[PDB]
Amino acid sequence: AHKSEVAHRFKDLGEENFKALVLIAFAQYLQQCPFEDHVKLVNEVTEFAKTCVADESAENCDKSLHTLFGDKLCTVATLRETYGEMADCCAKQEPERNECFLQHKDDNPNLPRLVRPEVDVMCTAFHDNEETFLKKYLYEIARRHPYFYAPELLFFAKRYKAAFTECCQAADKAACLLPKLDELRDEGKASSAKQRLKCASLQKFGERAFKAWAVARLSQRFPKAEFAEVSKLVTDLTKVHTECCHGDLLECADDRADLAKYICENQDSISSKLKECCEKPLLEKSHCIAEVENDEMPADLPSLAADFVESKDVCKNYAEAKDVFLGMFLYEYARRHPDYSVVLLLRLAKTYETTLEKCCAPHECYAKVFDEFKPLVEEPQNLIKQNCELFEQLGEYKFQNALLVRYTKKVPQVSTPTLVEVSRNLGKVGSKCCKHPEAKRMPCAEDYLSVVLNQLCVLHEKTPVSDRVTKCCTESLVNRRPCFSALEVDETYVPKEFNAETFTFHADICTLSEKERQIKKQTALVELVKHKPKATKEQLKAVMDDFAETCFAEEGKKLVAASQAALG
Ligand SMILES: CCN(CC)C(=O)COCCOCCNC(=O)COCCOCCNC(=O)CC[C@H](NC(=O)CCCCCCCCCCCCCCCCCCC(=O)O)C(=O)O
Ligand SMILES: CCCCCCCCCCCCCC(=O)O
Ligand SMILES: CCCCCCCCCCCCCC(=O)O
Ligand SMILES: CCCCCCCCCCCCCC(=O)O
């Protein structure tokens, strides 16, 4: 309860954050209004908010934020000519008016792709007007991503500003700024990818699948927290995620702020690692918590076998609260295993459940159910072992080439840029995740593969090319990676028709960027396999000591004509 929600927001966020969030909020609904129009709206909303700060009883200050926002959206003179049926929302009252606006947000829209200006033009633009530069970009990205959570979009903006101060004063601006902008763009695209992923999965897999995921994830985060606490948090985390997926910023904000506040008022019963997060302002609290490192395990933890295998009442305790029992199992397994992926722990829980359903329908039929856990644990642990002792012996590029031949052969119907992008991406996964010790490797792989495979399935959901790729993308979120890891070579594929122009290279290669020369060689590699999928070869680019001049044509046309018969 609050007399002026706008005054309260302005006070808890502060002028600068307030301004940026309103810009983002207005840009996500008014996607086609120019940067200068959104500036004048922000300035008008800001002047209004300050009158409420000076006086909560000032005219219209006691109206809800949803009310004021919809009112401001309906003052837009061009609303009907530009957004069409979005202007029909203004003929409704709250709550129907806000729900109407939410549904008219264009998930696309149709805007030219945002191109990275030259490093020196970015730094000069940033010098002469840091305000206009960053906030025009904040507006440009907000308008193209209307469903991306506004505070998180502001968090990215402050890291970009920080990338621009550290590098635009550096001797070689490009060398500093370019990896940083790549990091930020890939972090933001990962953030956007996993946002739509958990929302789609909530729709398709049901609240129970979400709550299971949450039990496992929270138990790894807070291993000293009791099951009752973890359960309370799973419940609240489930409400926040369902309401956040519906996409009402304000309702999402309040739910996230509430949960963060609860966690922070109950640190002693949750984790000893929340201290800093809990001192942070309201804007950063939830984000900070979502990102905190796993707390340390209590150490005295006995085996699960006593309550989940030996206990006379395994069936009795299970039958009287099937999901709470399975949730306690997951809690107990997950708190002891921050070394596992959440997807793996979920496999152990579904396996345990399958055993209980059969063995409780005989009782002491289970007991050796903890052996039925070893093959599922060994599987992602052995595949991490294999891929990391493949990255070691080859380096990022040579390994991308090793995975490239693989995925090209398995499912050859997928396009050449997609197969290059995915192998290049999984090459980053190996680079990132294999520099972490064995016990931090599965969450790492999981987190990166969940976005690599999400982006992949998103591509295949729009232009399908394989029935097996549809299966892995439409099977359980728990079987997505093992369904993908079980892909065999297409034994019924018809080799691609040779086209000399897609196999001939010119002088441009020596001058094209390091990244661009690689993509060019990697596309030609996807095609070298698309044409010869029966061609034998272990490690392609740089093998050995393990186990597991040039010319356009003339001298250039030699390889096209020679490898034509020197490969089958
Ligand atoms: C009465 C006239 N006014 C008022 C202007 C006066 O001041 C009196 O003036 C008379 C004397 O003249 C003085 C001199 N005059 C001047 O200078 C110019 O006068 C100016 C004359 O404008 C008159 C016309 N404008 C008006 O009335 C104001 C218009 C007003 N609407 C509005 O702006 C709409 C306000 C939008 C609500 C905010 C949502 C913004 C989003 C919140 C942020 C997102 C949340 C994130 C949380 C994350 C936390 C982490 C979450 C987690 O993740 O945990 C309205 O009507 O309601
Ligand atoms: C109280 C939380 C509910 C307990 C979760 C049940 C555990 C066994 C089922 C695991 C299934 C994985 C989730 C899914 O179906 O996608
Ligand atoms: C499926 C569309 C073609 C794009 C490339 C195929 C990627 C196959 C999924 C790989 C599964 C995870 C990595 C692994 O095998 O450890
Ligand atoms: C059909 C015969 C055409 C011959 C040209 C094939 C293209 C070869 C792919 C490029 C391999 C580069 C690998 C690397 O540099 O590590």
Side-chain angles (χ1 to χ4, degrees), residues 383 387 403 406-407 410-411 414 418-419 422-423 426 449 453 456 460 469 481 484-485 487:
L383 198 79
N387 288 82
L403 305 145
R406 269 228 226 88
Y407 306 139
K410 287 159 183 273
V411 64
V414 163
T418 303
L419 284 159
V422 181
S423 309
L426 293 163
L449 297 147
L453 295 170
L456 194 41
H460 201 266
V469 181
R481 198 275 319 148
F484 270 114
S485 280
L487 285 172

Side-chain angles (χ1 to χ4, degrees), residues 93-362 364-365:
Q93 25 71 83
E94 297 299 326
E96 209 204 357
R97 183 173 69 147
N98 196 86
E99 176 68 71
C100 183
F101 281 125
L102 215 46
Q103 289 204 282
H104 287 263
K105 260 179 165 172
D106 208 300
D107 190 281
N108 257 47
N110 320 96
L111 278 159
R113 80 151 190 92
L114 217 50
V115 320
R116 188 182 289 181
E118 280 308 318
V119 187
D120 55 352
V121 319
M122 281 186 296
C123 295
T124 304
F126 174 83
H127 167 280
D128 294 344
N129 217 314
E130 183 165 1
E131 171 197 289
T132 313
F133 181 72
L134 299 159
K135 74 148 117 145
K136 185 164 182 171
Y137 271 108
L138 183 60
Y139 149 81
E140 291 283 11
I141 71 167
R143 83 208 289 239
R144 281 157 188 83
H145 302 83
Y147 286 79
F148 191 113
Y149 189 49
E152 177 112 4
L153 201 74
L154 183 48
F155 149 87
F156 281 92
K158 303 174 173 183
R159 291 182 61 200
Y160 273 111
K161 180 176 191 151
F164 281 101
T165 316
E166 208 215 286
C167 306
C168 292
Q169 265 71 58
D172 196 301
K173 293 163 194 82
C176 181
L177 195 69
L178 296 184
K180 282 183 175 69
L181 301 168
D182 284 25
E183 211 216 331
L184 268 5
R185 192 50 72 183
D186 288 314
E187 278 165 300
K189 284 189 175 182
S191 184
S192 218
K194 46 210 276 180
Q195 254 162 276
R196 50 203 169 80
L197 181 90
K198 58 201 174 172
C199 292
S201 295
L202 193 44
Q203 313 274 63
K204 270 78 252 177
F205 300 114
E207 203 176 277
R208 196 193 170 258
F210 185 83
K211 282 184 274 175
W213 180 92
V215 172
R217 180 68 150 181
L218 279 148
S219 298
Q220 295 179 298
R221 281 284 199 274
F222 315 131
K224 299 183 167 106
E226 240 163 61
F227 170 72
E229 196 72 37
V230 170
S231 202
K232 162 150 198 84
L233 299 170
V234 164
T235 295
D236 306 336
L237 195 64
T238 301
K239 187 181 267 163
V240 170
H241 274 299
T242 317
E243 296 206 349
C244 290
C245 290
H246 179 86
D248 182 311
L249 166 65
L250 248 137
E251 299 286 288
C252 182
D254 296 338
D255 280 355
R256 288 185 58 127
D258 284 342
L259 185 42
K261 195 187 175 300
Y262 174 75
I263 290 162
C264 288
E265 276 279 69
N266 290 279
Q267 287 172 255
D268 275 279
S269 49
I270 300 149
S271 188
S272 51
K273 284 175 181 215
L274 296 150
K275 72 281 141 174
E276 166 200 39
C277 291
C278 292
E279 281 156 21
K280 300 229 180 181
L282 191 136
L283 184 75
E284 319 172 4
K285 213 179 291 299
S286 226
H287 184 261
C288 191
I289 303 159
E291 287 225 278
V292 287
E293 161 179 57
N294 290 324
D295 194 23
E296 317 277 308
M297 217 167 291
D300 61 304
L301 291 187
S303 93
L304 269 85
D307 295 295
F308 306 103
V309 150
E310 276 154 85
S311 187
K312 288 176 183 71
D313 330 298
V314 177
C315 291
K316 190 254 189 197
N317 300 165
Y318 176 63
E320 65 171 77
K322 283 189 191 192
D323 287 2
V324 171
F325 192 72
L326 294 173
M328 284 169 168
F329 168 85
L330 196 46
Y331 157 80
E332 298 290 2
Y333 225 118
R335 68 204 294 229
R336 281 170 180 81
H337 286 279
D339 64 312
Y340 293 175
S341 61
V342 172
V343 67
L344 163 68
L345 267 165
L346 256 18
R347 287 176 206 120
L348 302 177
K350 183 69 213 89
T351 305
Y352 181 60
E353 171 179 37
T354 303
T355 299
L356 259 45
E357 289 291 325
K358 252 292 197 88
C359 293
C360 292
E364 274 279 350
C365 156

Side-chain angles (χ1 to χ4, degrees), residues 527-537 540 542 548 553-559:
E527 302 288 358
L528 189 70
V529 172
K530 242 120 163 283
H531 182 213
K532 235 301 161 161
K534 291 212 269 181
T536 330
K537 223 41 76 56
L540 283 291
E554 203 180 277
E555 193 180 64
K557 269 197 174 193
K558 276 180 176 72
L559 283 104

Side-chain angles (χ1 to χ4, degrees), residues 6 9 13 18 21-22 25-26 44-45 48 51 59-60 63 65 68-69 71-72 149 151 249-250 253-254 256-257 260 282-283 286-287:
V6 74
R9 285 319 211 144
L13 297 157
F18 182 82
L21 299 166
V22 171
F26 278 86
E44 285 164 349
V45 160
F48 167 72
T51 84
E59 215 66 56
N60 316 304
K63 286 178 179 176
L65 292 179
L68 301 155
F69 185 79
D71 295 331
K72 196 83 182 164
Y149 189 49
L249 166 65
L250 248 137
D254 296 338
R256 288 185 58 127
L282 191 136
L283 184 75
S286 226
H287 184 261

